[PDB]
Design a protein around this ligand. Structure first.
Ligand SMILES: *[C@@H]1O[C@H](CO)[C@@H](O[C@@H]2O[C@H](CO)[C@@H](O[C@@H]3O[C@H](CO[C@H]4O[C@H](CO)[C@@H](O)[C@H](O)[C@@H]4O)[C@@H](O)[C@H](O[C@H]4O[C@H](CO)[C@@H](O)[C@H](O)[C@@H]4O[C@H]4O[C@H](CO)[C@@H](O)[C@H](O)[C@@H]4O)[C@@H]3O)[C@H](O)[C@H]2NC(C)=O)[C@H](O)[C@H]1NC(C)=O
Ligand SMILES: *[C@@H]1O[C@H](CO)[C@@H](O)[C@H](O)[C@H]1NC(C)=O
Lengths: 105, 105
């Protein structure tokens, strides 16, 4: 309904079933992208040139071409204590877990 | 309406109203991503760990959190001859123009 932005989402690992292997943390502030990517896209929309092109194409062909979508543009990692694929409990940074910024792609 | 994948698209510059500033090309093959991040039986959804976390959360709470989006994972550049600030034909390499591949983000 509204323009593309990041929304807050706590994820409990025991709800998703990741607590079989994740010892810490019990969950995390993963956040989620939502909102519209409508013409004209501003600097804050973190758009790609293709998202700007697709924006115009959808205006004239809304039946066949979708608008660009609101997806994470910057993801960060979280440090977690977990069971390895070698049966070892390790403290490693687990990539692409947290939304830092949203954008139109 | 269908499973996340890259689709073809030819963008004609006169149709988008850009024939005035882009001296060449007249258009190009931009492609677009479309489809639901449904994780089908005989397909490989390229997905970040966030998009996997968001999928799990969506399946357990569909009314609260939307599914991750079918966004471009790889984009490529195209070169264009455009009209300068001072009205002169200039060759510039336009980044993030062509969709090379799609995935769930
Ligand atoms: C288009 O894209 C941009 C770029 O991503 C985006 O704007 C970005 O907004 C985000 C927040 O939405 C900004 O993120 C914050 O930035 C600071 C920067 O910190 C510097 O200093 C320290 C110390 O060395 C370092 O951590 C860092 O390396 C920097 O040099 C961070 O301090 C913020 O961290 C907090 O939030 C994180 C998650 O985002 C947590 O992981 C973290 O532990 C921090 O928690 C604090 O705030 C939380 C709320 O976010 C809260 O949960 C806690 O209670 C706590 O108080 C954070 O990373 C980012 O830098 C912006 N970047 C720019 C370039 O402006 C735009 O929003 C986007 N467009 C759209 C449409 O979304
Ligand atoms: C997903 O896409 C990126 C960039 O196109 C690539 O580096 C990576 O190897 C891909 N992952 C899988 C599992 O196909």
């Amino acid at each position: 309904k509204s323009s593309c932005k990041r929304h807050p989402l706590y994820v409990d690992f025991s709800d998703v079933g990741w607590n079989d292997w994740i010892v810490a943390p019990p969950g995390y502030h993963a956040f989620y992208c939502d909102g519209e990517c409508s013409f004209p896209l501003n600097a804050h929309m973190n758009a790609t040139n293709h998202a700007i092109v697709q924006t115009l194409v959808h205006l004239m062909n809304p039946e066949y071409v979708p608008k660009p979508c609101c997806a994470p543009t910057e993801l960060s990692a979280i440090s977690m204590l977990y069971l390895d694929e070698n049966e070892k409990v390790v403290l490693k940074n687990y990539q692409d877990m947290v939304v830092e910024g949203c954008g139109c792609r």
